[PDB]
Copies of this chain bind each other. A is one copy, B any other.
């Protein structure tokens, strides 16, 4: 059910991101949800290199 419609243009500083979630493949759009230290859940574009770079390291 949970999906992204608008992606953030804010390249959230990596150390302000505590985790991320991927959205269902049934969503019309692909999306990852970034969770910030302030507890916001912010949709971001997985086709964006900066988002991909954060995910690659956030896994470590």
Chain A interface residues toward B at CB < 8 A: 1-3, 5-6, 24, 26-29
Contacts and interface: CB of A to CB of B under 8 A. Distances in A.
Nearest to A29: B26
Contacts of A2: 5-6
Contacts of A3: 5
A3 to B, nearest CB: 7
Contacts of A24: 5-6
A2 B24 CA distance: 15
Given A1-B5, A5-B27, A26-B28, 7 more contacts: A2-B5, A2-B6, A3-B5, A5-B24, A5-B26, A6-B24, A26-B29
